[PDB]
Design a protein around this ligand. Structure first.
Ligand SMILES: *CCN(CC[C@H](N)C(=O)O)C[C@H]1O[C@@H](n2cnc3c(N)ncnc32)[C@H](O)[C@@H]1O
Ligand SMILES: [Mn+2]
Ligand SMILES: [Mn+2]
Lengths: 315, 303
């Protein structure tokens, strides 16, 4: 309980940072402006570059999954926050059969207000809906192609029930996304979640972006710093190394796993992309980026992906 | 008259010590008196030992207070600062105001040099502009300080033997007389001598080299040794680079780097150091961590 307000506060942080990078042209998002204010104080170049690689990272894995399943699938964004992926997938003509989002009721309430208030958000959902009205009773928005569910991820009975209420199909291939979320719950709770995800789908994928190599002074200072913001990282013990991150996924029901630290990913970016970004802002101290990026990772696991060839997916 | 002004400045120093910023007009006056002082100062500031030498502070006010507890307070301790007073830390206003206030109050006891962050363009990006615009309601104060940075001396020389500057050496400079010949009263240029002094870095590479900073140059030990022997110097002292242990010898002790912002950006975990020089130029270092400031708010991560 005591930590939940602080954890919920992090959604405002990531949203602010993502919009700011977008405003200065790191990537294209015409939808985030409807969810969060434009920060008037800059985020430092390494934060914006860092958020870029994170976004690019997950974006490339999502595209690959959709490609391999020919969009005949489900995507379940876990701890989605102010995620705009639904609308962006609809523009790119890469929409999955249904898009599911999950977060604390408090967060969902913020997101349902924005959706209901602003037609740029609600029309695209209705264009694809069976009804002329979006119905938002409780802390749930349900539609044909898009659902937003208010649930605690640490209570799996609540989670499963509501996804199935929103007619999630167990037999469809399914990509699940935990973009900086698992680290806010206990190691045992995030294991339960991963286990359940692996048990629910014969054909599935999991993207996990979070902290890594946290067993040093840098990681310790971060832990202490986030506690000033009343936000404890309940699952840091799982953020030991890339090896433990891959082992966390395999031990909890998945057949293959891969992980790269964010910097490794940064240096593996296409040169044309690097050139575009590095001409957006000037960063004189690359060692600051280096230190930050080595402490985060992008991991992905699959299971039952033989016929589809999900073993071959890369960022 | 200036009799009244000196009394008020004591009160300002008293105020800034408890991290309370000065009013808009107060800053305007302080910068003008500082301008009139700095104009009459050389590009190469000749300093007498004993002196305590400091590097990057970057708006980390409470850690500057930690610096003073350890090195002794001004003007009891003769001080020489090597720039980078602003940006990244959350208290650039208080930090840079106090250091300027100490200069105006004790001109003979404080040397403040220009760092690469004492620049218009850089402060617009790395936090200082944003801090002034928040702490005050407009850009006037940013304007007043940035206008002043143009007057900050580029370089200092301790007792004809120890050469102090923020960044490093330049291919456009062989002698100190090449330094005093420069026109420093301008915004830090993109290229050229004045630029390189504030931006350059030493490295393990032989000779000169392209800088990964994208401004100034990377110089090897052979450049340090030519410049020291050609100018009768024993040591080039500098800041500008993060060092994990607070200070770092390189180039067979021809160069030393001093970094005085502990736990840089409130993230890095580095020690900060300061270099004391005694009455006969013998050196020693004082390592220190940040002050325990409970109300300091979080730096950015990926959340
Ligand atoms: C780090 C901030 N968000 C990230 C949101 C999104 N993935 C992004 O912008 O990248 C973290 C979100 O995770 C939610 N959250 C944490 N813990 C839970 C539980 N137990 N149940 C439901 N949601 C959870 C936070 O509320 C936040 O939105
Ligand atoms: Mn510098
Ligand atoms: Mn610096």
């Amino acid at each position: 309980d005591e930590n939940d307000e602080g954890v919920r506060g992090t959604c405002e942080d990531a949203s602010l940072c993502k919009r700011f990078a977008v405003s200065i042209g790191y990537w294209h998002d015409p939808y985030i402006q409807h969810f969060v204010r434009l920060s008037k104080e800059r985020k430092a170049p390494e934060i914006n570059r860092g958020y870029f690689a994170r976004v690019h990272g997950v974006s490339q894995l999502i595209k690959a999954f959709l490609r391999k399943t020919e969009c005949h699938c489900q995507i379940v964004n876990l701890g989605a926050g102010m995620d705009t992926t639904f609308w962006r997938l609809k523009d790119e003509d890469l929409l999955s059969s249904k898009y599911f989002e999950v977060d604390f009721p408090m967060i969902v309430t913020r997101k349902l207000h924005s959706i209901k208030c602003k037609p740029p958000l609600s029309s695209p959902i209705l264009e694809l809906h069976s009804e002329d009205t979006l119905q938002m009773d409780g802390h749930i928005l349900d539609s044909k192609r898009y659902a937003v569910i208010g649930a605690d991820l640490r209570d799996l009975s609540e989670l499963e029930e509501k996804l199935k209420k929103c007619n999630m199909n167990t037999q469809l291939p399914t990509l699940l996304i935990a973009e900086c979320v698992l680290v806010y719950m206990t190691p045992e709770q995030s294991a339960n979640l991963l286990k359940w995800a692996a048990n629910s789908f014969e054909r599935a994928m999991f993207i996990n972006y979070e902290q890594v190599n946290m067993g040093d002074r840098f990681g310790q200072i971060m832990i202490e710093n986030l506690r000033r913001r009343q936000c404890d990282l309940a699952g840091v013990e799982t953020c030991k190394s890339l090896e433990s991150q891959k082992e966390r996924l395999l031990s909890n029901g998945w057949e293959t796993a891969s992980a790269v630290d964010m910097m490794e990913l940064y240096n593996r970016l296409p040169r044309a992309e690097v050139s575009r970004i590095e001409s957006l802002e000037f960063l004189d101290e690359m060692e600051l980026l280096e230190q930050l990026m080595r402490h985060y990772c992008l991991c992905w696991a699959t299971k039952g992906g033989n016929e589809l060839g999900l073993k071959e997916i890369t960022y | 008259d200036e009799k009244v002004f000196t009394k008020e400045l004591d009160q300002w120093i008293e105020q800034l010590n408890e991290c309370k910023q000065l009013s808009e007009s107060q800053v305007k006056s302080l910068c003008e008196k500082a301008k009139e002082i700095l104009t009459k100062e050389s590009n190469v500031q000749e300093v007498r030992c004993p002196v305590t030498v400091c590097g990057d502070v970057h708006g980390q006010f409470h850690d500057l207070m930690e610096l003073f507890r350890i090195g002794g307070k001004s003007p009891d301790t003769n001080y020489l600062f090597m720039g980078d007073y602003v940006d990244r830390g959350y208290y650039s206003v208080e930090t840079v105001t106090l250091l300027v206030a100490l200069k105006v109050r004790y001109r003979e006891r404080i040397t403040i040099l220009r760092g690469n962050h004492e620049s218009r363009q850089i402060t617009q990006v790395y936090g200082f502009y944003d801090e002034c615009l928040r702490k005050y309601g407009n850009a006037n104060v940013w304007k007043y300080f940035t206008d002043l940075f143009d007057y900050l001396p580029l370089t200092a020389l301790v007792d004809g033997q120890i050469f102090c500057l923020h960044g490093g050496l330049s291919p456009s400079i062989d002698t100190l007389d090449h330094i005093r010949a420069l026109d420093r009263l301008q915004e830090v240029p993109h290229e050229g001598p004045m630029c390189d002094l504030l931006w350059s870095d030493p490295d393990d590479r032989g000779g000169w080299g392209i800088s990964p900073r994208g401004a100034g140059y990377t110089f090897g030990q052979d450049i340090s040794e030519t410049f020291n022997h050609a100018n009768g110097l024993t040591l080039v002292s500098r800041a500008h680079q993060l060092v994990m242990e607070g200070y770092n010898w390189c180039h067979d002790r021809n160069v030393v780097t001093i970094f005085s912002a502990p736990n840089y950006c409130y993230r890095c975990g580095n020690q900060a150091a300061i270099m004391e020089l005694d009455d006969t130029l013998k050196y020693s270092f004082l390592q220190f961590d940040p002050a325990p400031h409970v109300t300091r708010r979080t730096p950015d991560y990926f959340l």
